Design an enzyme around this catalytic site. Structure first.
Site, mmCIF file in Angstrom:
data_model
loop_
_atom_site.group_PDB
_atom_site.id
_atom_site.type_symbol
_atom_site.label_atom_id
_atom_site.label_comp_id
_atom_site.label_asym_id
_atom_site.label_seq_id
_atom_site.Cartn_x
_atom_site.Cartn_y
_atom_site.Cartn_z
ATOM 1 N N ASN A 133 3.560 -1.820 8.998
ATOM 2 C CA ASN A 133 3.636 -0.452 8.490
ATOM 3 C C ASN A 133 5.041 0.136 8.740
ATOM 4 O OD1 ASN A 133 2.676 2.162 7.540
ATOM 5 N ND2 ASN A 133 0.585 1.401 8.152
ATOM 6 N N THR A 134 5.182 1.423 8.462
ATOM 7 C CA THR A 134 6.433 2.149 8.725
ATOM 8 C C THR A 134 6.660 2.354 10.214
ATOM 9 O OG1 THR A 134 5.263 4.216 8.314
ATOM 10 C CG2 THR A 134 6.450 3.195 6.401
ATOM 11 N N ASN A 138 8.182 9.204 5.076
ATOM 12 C CA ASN A 138 6.990 9.888 4.557
ATOM 13 C C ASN A 138 6.030 10.305 5.633
ATOM 14 O OD1 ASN A 138 4.102 8.458 4.354
ATOM 15 N ND2 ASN A 138 5.740 6.866 4.439
ATOM 16 N N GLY A 169 12.040 0.900 4.241
ATOM 17 C CA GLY A 169 13.276 0.439 3.664
ATOM 18 C C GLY A 169 14.178 -0.331 4.580
ATOM 19 N N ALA A 225 0.822 -1.204 0.000
ATOM 20 C CA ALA A 225 0.000 0.000 0.000
ATOM 21 C C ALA A 225 0.847 1.240 0.000
ATOM 22 C CB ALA A 225 -0.937 0.011 1.206
ATOM 23 N N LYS A 271 -3.645 -4.310 9.441
ATOM 24 C CA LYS A 271 -2.247 -3.905 9.253
ATOM 25 C C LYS A 271 -1.747 -3.209 10.495
ATOM 26 C CE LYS A 271 0.969 -1.824 6.006
ATOM 27 N NZ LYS A 271 1.061 -1.263 4.606
ATOM 28 N N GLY A 316 11.210 -3.403 4.244
ATOM 29 C CA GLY A 316 12.597 -3.565 3.874
ATOM 30 C C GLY A 316 12.951 -4.778 3.004
ATOM 31 N N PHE A 344 -2.488 10.360 4.424
ATOM 32 C CA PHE A 344 -3.687 9.825 3.750
ATOM 33 C C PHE A 344 -4.250 10.807 2.731
ATOM 34 C CE2 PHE A 344 -5.256 6.844 7.439
ATOM 35 C CZ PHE A 344 -4.422 5.806 7.040
ATOM 36 N N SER A 376 -0.978 3.725 10.386
ATOM 37 C CA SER A 376 -0.305 4.879 9.856
ATOM 38 C C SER A 376 0.214 5.733 10.998
ATOM 39 C CB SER A 376 -1.251 5.739 9.023
ATOM 40 O OG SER A 376 -0.519 6.906 8.641
ATOM 41 N N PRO A 377 1.482 6.151 10.892
ATOM 42 C CA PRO A 377 1.978 7.080 11.914
ATOM 43 C C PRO A 377 1.634 8.526 11.667
ATOM 44 C CG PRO A 377 3.778 6.433 10.481
ATOM 45 C CD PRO A 377 2.551 5.679 9.996
ATOM 46 N N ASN A 378 0.911 8.809 10.585
ATOM 47 C CA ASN A 378 0.718 10.183 10.094
ATOM 48 C C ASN A 378 -0.694 10.728 10.214
ATOM 49 O OD1 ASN A 378 3.478 10.193 9.393
ATOM 50 N ND2 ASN A 378 2.974 8.996 7.496
ATOM 51 N N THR A 379 -1.540 10.009 10.946
ATOM 52 C CA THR A 379 -2.900 10.476 11.295
ATOM 53 C C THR A 379 -3.048 10.436 12.820
ATOM 54 O OG1 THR A 379 -3.895 9.874 9.177
ATOM 55 C CG2 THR A 379 -5.396 10.000 11.081
ATOM 56 N N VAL A 399 -4.809 0.398 10.746
ATOM 57 C CA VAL A 399 -4.831 1.115 12.000
ATOM 58 C C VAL A 399 -3.393 1.473 12.451
ATOM 59 C CG1 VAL A 399 -7.066 0.322 12.856
ATOM 60 C CG2 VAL A 399 -4.992 -1.061 13.207
HETATM 61 C C1 LIG Z 1 5.524 6.829 0.478
HETATM 62 C C2 LIG Z 1 4.808 5.731 1.274
HETATM 63 C C3 LIG Z 1 3.439 5.804 1.459
HETATM 64 C C4 LIG Z 1 2.774 4.819 2.160
HETATM 65 N N1 LIG Z 1 1.408 4.851 2.320
HETATM 66 C C5 LIG Z 1 0.712 3.809 2.909
HETATM 67 C C6 LIG Z 1 -0.672 3.773 2.942
HETATM 68 O O1 LIG Z 1 -1.417 4.628 2.397
HETATM 69 N N2 LIG Z 1 -1.242 2.720 3.571
HETATM 70 C C7 LIG Z 1 -0.551 1.706 4.207
HETATM 71 O O2 LIG Z 1 -1.135 0.797 4.771
HETATM 72 N N3 LIG Z 1 0.803 1.751 4.164
HETATM 73 C C8 LIG Z 1 1.432 2.757 3.522
HETATM 74 N N4 LIG Z 1 2.811 2.780 3.461
HETATM 75 C C9 LIG Z 1 3.549 1.709 4.132
HETATM 76 C C10 LIG Z 1 3.980 0.574 3.214
HETATM 77 O O3 LIG Z 1 2.821 -0.145 2.689
HETATM 78 C C11 LIG Z 1 4.834 -0.513 3.852
HETATM 79 O O4 LIG Z 1 4.075 -1.047 4.986
HETATM 80 C C12 LIG Z 1 6.162 0.119 4.397
HETATM 81 O O5 LIG Z 1 6.640 1.163 3.542
HETATM 82 C C13 LIG Z 1 7.259 -0.972 4.540
HETATM 83 O O6 LIG Z 1 7.607 -1.603 3.338
HETATM 84 P P1 LIG Z 1 8.870 -1.106 2.446
HETATM 85 O O7 LIG Z 1 10.066 -1.033 3.456
HETATM 86 O O8 LIG Z 1 9.040 -2.206 1.411
HETATM 87 O O9 LIG Z 1 8.531 0.225 1.816
HETATM 88 C C14 LIG Z 1 3.488 3.764 2.711
HETATM 89 C C15 LIG Z 1 4.846 3.706 2.511
HETATM 90 C C16 LIG Z 1 5.544 4.676 1.788
HETATM 91 C C17 LIG Z 1 7.066 4.559 1.613
HETATM 92 O O1 LIG Z 2 -0.527 8.372 4.122
HETATM 93 C C1 LIG Z 2 0.483 8.184 4.775
HETATM 94 O O2 LIG Z 2 1.076 9.074 5.428
HETATM 95 C C2 LIG Z 2 0.907 6.806 5.192
HETATM 96 C C3 LIG Z 2 -0.013 5.878 5.625
HETATM 97 C C4 LIG Z 2 0.463 4.667 6.157
HETATM 98 O O3 LIG Z 2 -0.294 3.777 6.534
HETATM 99 N N1 LIG Z 2 1.817 4.479 6.299
HETATM 100 C C5 LIG Z 2 2.714 5.457 5.908
HETATM 101 O O4 LIG Z 2 3.921 5.275 6.086
HETATM 102 N N2 LIG Z 2 2.269 6.621 5.387
#
Ligand SMILES: Cc1cc2nc3c(=O)[nH]c(=O)nc-3n(C[C@H](O)[C@H](O)[C@H](O)COP(=O)(O)O)c2cc1C
Ligand SMILES: O=C(O)c1cc(=O)[nH]c(=O)[nH]1
Ligand SMILES: CCc1cc(O)n2nc(SCc3cc(Cl)ccc3Cl)nc2n1
Ligand SMILES: [Cl-]
Length: 353
Positions: free
Chosen positions: A241-242, A102, A263, A53, A212, A292, A106, A172-175, A170
């Protein structure tokens, strides 16, 4: 050469937009081995490597993503009403760490726009799913919503009928306040409502429901989530998630920007969270592992820790489309070296040694 040029010229958000456009237009070898097929969540997956996502928030590039070689696509997060997200700048590269931070917040075209986009290709997707290429839809909540559970319920009713699985995001660190929905009582209430709504959909339109979760949970939080998932019969977990952590050793100049880190620095924190959640759910709850993954080894580590499927995003931003085939080819080679008959045999293997 071609990608780094466009990315050095553009800020990361602009580069993201270009990538979505290029992918959506199909401006982009590996044939999947039988060893890579996985049956889980009521579906066949031709290979276990999906797009996480956040890449295709608004469902604009689904077909291009399958063309890139992903075994499954997840779109979103989608919010009920359209919203712009956080002020810019809101995406930052940490090239020395192979990481991104990031704080999008949302940004979303909203449920109605996405519904219509998916409806335009609904029967094409039905054929793709039948052919082992499922579609997931990840749901979020609006910033100014006074009833989080009702936002998720709206998502289930609008996009549930177009999805093979739904994700209750549930983590996202950004809401503000969102991650509190991972708490036992809040999660149980929220998920009960979500599952009631899902169960009300007609059979051929009834998706699996996954939750998630964050990489930053306490041991108590993880135990609580496991208990609720089992109590309610949640279909699976997406882990993770992040992170809001900033691991010691980050080098990027932008390391202290607010947001979720993704990453390489997230990789092992995510793997260990998979491991814990697999154990707490007795291996009975499918897990999609994410965080990652940039190689076959990274993928296999998550599979052995308990993931049935994996996803990536951040690696694509550094290495481009070829990373997908690379992960798949390397994963197949490792499975053979380690004496596994296929992916399915490797799921949870570390817990059995
Ligand atoms: C730019 C960006 C936007 C993201 N937006 C969402 C999001 O809308 N919803 C969600 O569940 N995770 C979101 N994520 C989290 C990723 O789905 C994934 O859980 C996280 O980046 C770890 O995987 P990666 O290390 O392969 O990027 C986002 C990640 C990035 C880098
Ligand atoms: O929209 C975003 O800020 C976003 C949502 C999410 O679930 N995870 C993330 O890293 N960013
Ligand atoms: C974290 C926001 C962001 C940034 C970025 O350079 N990319 N790149 C991708 S996919 C790689 C790609 C980049 C470009 Cl410039 C053109 C096509 C493609 Cl596939 N996704 C991204 N997302
Ligand atoms: Cl429908």
């Amino acid at each position: 050469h071609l990608m780094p040029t466009l990315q050095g010229l553009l800020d990361p958000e602009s580069a993201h937009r270009l990538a979505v456009r290029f992918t959506s237009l199909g401006l982009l070898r590996f044939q999947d081995s039988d060893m890579l097929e996985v049956r889980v969540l009521g579906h066949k997956f031709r290979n276990p490597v999906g797009i996480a996502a956040g890449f295709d928030k608004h469902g604009e590039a689904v077909d291009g993503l399958y063309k890139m070689g992903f075994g499954f696509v997840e779109i979103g997060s989608v919010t009920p009403k359209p919203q712009e997200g956080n002020p810019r700048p809101r995406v930052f590269r940490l090239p020395e760490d192979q990481a991104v931070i990031n704080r999008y917040g949302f940004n979303s075209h909203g449920l109605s726009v996405v519904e219509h986009r998916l409806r335009a290709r609904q029967q094409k997707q039905a054929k793709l799913t039948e052919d082992g290429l499922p579609l997931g839809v990840n749901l979020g909540k609006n910033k100014t919503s006074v009833d989080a559970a009702e936002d998720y319920a709206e998502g289930v009713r609008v996009l549930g009928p177009l999805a093979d699985y739904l994700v209750v995001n549930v983590s996202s660190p950004n809401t503000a306040g969102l991650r509190s929905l991972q708490g036992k009582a809040e999660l149980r209430r929220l998920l009960t409502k979500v599952l009631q709504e899902r169960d009300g959909l007609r059979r051929v339109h009834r998706p699996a429901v996954l939750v998630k979760i964050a990489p930053d949970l306490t041991s108590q939080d993880k135990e609580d989530i496991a208990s609720v998932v089992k109590e309610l019969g949640i279909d699976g977990l997406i882990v993770t998630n992040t992170t809001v952590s900033r691991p010691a050793g980050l080098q990027g100049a932008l390391r202290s920007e607010t947001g979720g880190l993704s990453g390489k620095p997230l990789r092992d924190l995510s793997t260990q969270t998979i491991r814990e959640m697999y154990a707490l759910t007795q291996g009975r709850v499918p897990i999609i592992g994410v965080g990652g993954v940039s190689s076959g080894q990274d993928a296999l580590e998550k599979i052995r820790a308990g993931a049935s499927l994996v996803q990536l995003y951040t690696a694509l931003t550094f290495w481009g489309p070829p990373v997908v085939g690379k992960v798949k080819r390397e994963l197949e080679a490792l499975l053979k070296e380690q004496g596994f008959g296929g992916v399915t045999d490797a799921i949870g293997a570390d817990h059995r040694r």
